[PDB]
Task: inverse folding
RNA sequence: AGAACCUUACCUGGUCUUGACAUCCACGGAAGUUUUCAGAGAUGAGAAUGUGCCUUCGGGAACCGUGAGACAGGUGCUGCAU
């Protein structure tokens, strides 16, 4: 829901879900053209922490 | 019309669909100007070890119904007899005894 | 203003635009003389004019396209005679008394089957 | 022999085609051969069913048969059961989904195809050919047909020299192209040889 | 011999990290210890001394190397680094050039009235940035022109 | 804006069917160029009729395919679906190029 | 968004019985998934349970 | 309305016979694919690989072969049986 002004005051769970989906899309891209082990280990580790 | 000669036609379209359009490349550009040495000369040797079938010139284009080799029509796939008996029935769309 | 008559001889299609003015003939951005004006009895491009309007105080703008020479020469002639529409049957009557108004509908024949040239049959022998 | 086919001369005039679809040059042949496959397979198994004509439509990668019979209750079985026993096999040969339609003819003695099988079925059941022929002429004029002409030719009667006898009634004008003359041909494998039946039915003047 | 290593930067300031890295090299003049710098990850041709490691981590807006451990960080598996770099480059063309190119290839429509339909691209127009694909409407493949972003590759 | 090129074998059908393809458009899009006929392709096949000798008895055949154009004016989404998705008359080809 | 954190087809229509924009603005066909943008056709509290 | 082989039915020679083409039976193997030698080729001997679909899995049948008899095949004859 927005506030008086109009800027949407967004919840915290939308930040969490949007982070997990951004990282998951990056990791899938790192499965198609993909990239070396160290890269996908950091990518999966950032998804785990997300 | 000689059911063996119908069966000899149906095996030739299979070999033309397994080898050639895929192994006509050996004659396509490997018989064109490049390193035209024994690399080319091997490829001119290497397409005779393919069967004597599987080239599209071996195909006869017999009738689809009667298998008659002469009198074929490459719009319908029938012979000239089987197109006329069908057309006067109304098995072939938009066709009639016309005159101009 | 501006007047018209078509003419359609022998699968050639003429567009004759008649207007009073000069006495020139323009045929498809060529003059008459350079198009076929030294060729093969051109008289039919003027045969209605030397019949009635000897003065020829009207310039002809002709654009014909289509088939051969004499048919194009004839389709012009049927075009001009139909283009005397403001100068009508007061003087198009004497046009009909010299023919001159028919399409001359005479197409070539279609080659029939069996034969060779739509009437010429290929030389049978009795034995 | 010397007469033109009465239906094939009238396709653009009165009688519609028995197969109406468009196809370009690339797909004209394999439509036509699959169209032949539905016609030979249906009459392969609808021999009891008294089937006259099978019209074919193709709406954009679809096949739509339309079967004209005089026994619509037999082909459906009960509640359209054996219709989709025919749909299963015509989906095989055509490769696309298949909607099946059916329209009855309540006057089977008025179309050329069924009066042929009113004759050509009996001739192998050792009926005298003049009896089956003349009954077919009487049956059509009884039911109000404006013309009828039926011809049988072959080794009929168990002879050795073939004949060609024919019976007619009323008006059957084969040069008046306004006429919707129904014409159909059939054959009869007897013991001595085949018998060709040719029946013309003149329905109306326009 | 100089082997490759992977550096993590603040994602978005990557060109500025690369420029500051080249400048720190030419400041602390360990010129014989760095080969190149390739472009959120920065590829560095390097050798491993602890001095050069402190140099790269003293470059600003750099988190650290990515490897098995932080004592002796790990060179480069280069399993699909080229393909990742290829994607980065392709993206440019894929967006800017948007070369609509497909034949007999099936595509997917998610825009206009043809949304939620698939079809094949009989003709392609990279110059006009338009794909010629027909969508089976009532069975009839309705050949329509859709943009690369208007349809998805199938 | 959108070329509508449609082909069929029957002239009384293709020209009947072009009346409603603009009636489903001028009801909503309210601007069409106009029904444009196109010169028909007549393919002839004249071929023998006997199963043997007498190569003088032939029967001339001809299959006439026609083409029509209407080339609708307005590319508003409503009109697009009322033509692209709404195709009628089985046995009539219709192909569109936007 | 077409298919984002806050989708239409995956969850439901924001407005009650309104599909999306130009489709179903009365009470007759509740359910038809319009082509303009894939969307469910239900009430306003249907997204709270999905 | 189109024979270099093909077509092709003719000829020499090399071959196989329940058969190249259909239905049926019993077995065994997914089917398929790659490649080598011997051979004029047909074929013969292989050598590798694949090992999918429905499940009562003691499965069955899309599919390749081997054996079974029904049969299949005939552009063989007679247009003066049709």
Result:
């Amino acid at each position: 829901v927005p506030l008086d002004g109009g800027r949407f005051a967004t919840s915290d769970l939308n930040d969490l879900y949007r982070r997990v989906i951004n990282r998951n899309n990056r990791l899938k891209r790192l499965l198609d053209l993909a990239a070396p082990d160290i890269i996908v280990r950091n990518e999966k580790r950032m998804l785990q922490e997300a | 019309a000689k059911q063996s000669m119908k069966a000899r036609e149906v095996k030739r379209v299979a070999l033309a669909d397994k080898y050639f359009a895929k192994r006509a490349e050996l004659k396509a550009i490997i018989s064109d100007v490049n390193a035209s040495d024994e690399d080319r000369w091997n490829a001119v040797l290497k397409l005779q070890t393919l069967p004597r079938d599987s080239s599209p010139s071996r195909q006869r284009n017999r009738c689809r119904q009667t298998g008659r080799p002469h009198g074929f029509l490459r719009k319908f796939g029938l012979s000239r007899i089987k197109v006329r008996e069908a057309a006067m029935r109304g098995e072939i769309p938009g066709l009639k005894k016309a005159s101009w | 203003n501006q007047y018209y008559g078509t003419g359609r001889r022998k699968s050639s299609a003429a567009r004759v635009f008649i207007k009073p003015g000069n006495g020139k003939i323009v045929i498809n951005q060529r003059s008459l003389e350079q198009y076929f004006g030294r060729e093969t009895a051109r008289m039919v491009v003027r045969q209605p004019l030397e019949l009635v309007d000897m003065v020829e105080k009207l310039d002809l703008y002709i654009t014909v396209k289509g088939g051969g020479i004499s048919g194009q020469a004839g389709a012009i002639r049927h075009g001009i005679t139909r283009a005397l529409m403001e100068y009508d049957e007061s003087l198009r009557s004497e046009l009909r008394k010299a023919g001159f108004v028919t399409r001359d509908a005479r197409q070539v024949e279609r080659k029939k089957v069996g034969l060779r040239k739509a009437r010429r049959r290929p030389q049978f022998s009795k034995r | 022999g010397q007469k033109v086919h009465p239906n094939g001369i009238r396709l653009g005039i009165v009688k519609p085609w028995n197969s109406t679809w468009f196809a370009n040059t690339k797909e004209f042949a394999d439509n036509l051969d699959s169209d032949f496959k539905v016609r030979q397979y249906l009459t392969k198994e609808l021999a009891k069913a008294s089937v006259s004509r099978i019209v074919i439509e193709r709406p954009a990668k679809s096949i739509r048969v339309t079967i004209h019979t005089a026994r619509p209750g037999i082909v459906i079985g009960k509640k359209g059961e054996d219709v989709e026993k025919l749909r299963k096999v015509v989906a095989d040969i055509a490769g696309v989904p298949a909607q099946i339609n059916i329209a009855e003819v309540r006057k089977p003695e008025l179309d050329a195809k069924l009066v042929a099988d009113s004759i050509t079925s009996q001739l192998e059941r050792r009926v005298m050919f003049r009896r089956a022929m003349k009954r077919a002429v009487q049956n059509a004029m009884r039911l109000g047909a404006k013309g009828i002409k039926v011809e049988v030719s072959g080794r009929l009667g168990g002879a050795e020299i073939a004949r060609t006898e024919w019976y007619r009634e009323g008006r059957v004008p084969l040069h008046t192209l306004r006429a919707d003359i129904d014409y159909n041909t059939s054959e009869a494998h007897t013991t001595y040889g085949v018998i060709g039946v040719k029946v013309w039915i003149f329905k109306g003047e326009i | 011999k100089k082997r490759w290593y992977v550096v993590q930067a603040f994602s978005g300031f990557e060109g500025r990290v690369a420029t500051s890295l080249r400048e720190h090299i030419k400041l602390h003049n360990m010129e014989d210890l760095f080969g190149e710098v390739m472009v959120g990850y920065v590829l560095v041709q390097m050798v491993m001394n602890d001095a050069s490691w402190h140099l790269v981590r003293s470059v600003p807006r750099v988190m650290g190397f990515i490897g098995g451990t932080s004592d002796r960080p790990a060179p480069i598996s280069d399993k699909e680094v080229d393909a990742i770099m290829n994607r980065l480059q392709q993206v440019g063309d894929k967006p800017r050039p948007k070369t609509l190119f497909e034949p007999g290839e099936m595509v997917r429509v998610n825009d206009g009235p043809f949304a939620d339909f698939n079809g094949v691209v009989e003709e392609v127009d990279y110059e006009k940035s338009r794909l010629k694909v027909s969508v089976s409407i009532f069975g009839r493949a309705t050949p329509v022109e859709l943009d690369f972003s208007q349809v998805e590759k199938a | 804006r959108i070329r509508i090129r449609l082909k069929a074998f029957d002239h009384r059908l293709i020209d009947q069917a072009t009346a409603e393809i603009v009636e489903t458009a001028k009801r909503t899009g309210a601007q069409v160029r106009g029904p444009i006929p196109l010169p028909t392709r007549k393919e002839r096949f004249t071929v023998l009729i006997s199963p043997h000798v007498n190569k003088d008895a032939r029967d001339q055949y001809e299959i006439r395919t026609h083409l029509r154009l209407v080339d609708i004016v307005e590319p508003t989404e409503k009109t697009v679906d009322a033509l692209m998705r709404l195709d009628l008359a089985a046995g009539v080809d219709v192909q569109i190029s936007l | 968004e077409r298919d984002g954190l806050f989708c239409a087809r995956i969850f439901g229509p924001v407005k009650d019985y309104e599909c999306l924009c130009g489709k179903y603005k009365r009470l007759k066909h509740r359910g038809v998934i319009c082509e303009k943008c894939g969307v469910e056709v239900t009430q306003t509290k249907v997204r709270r349970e999905r």
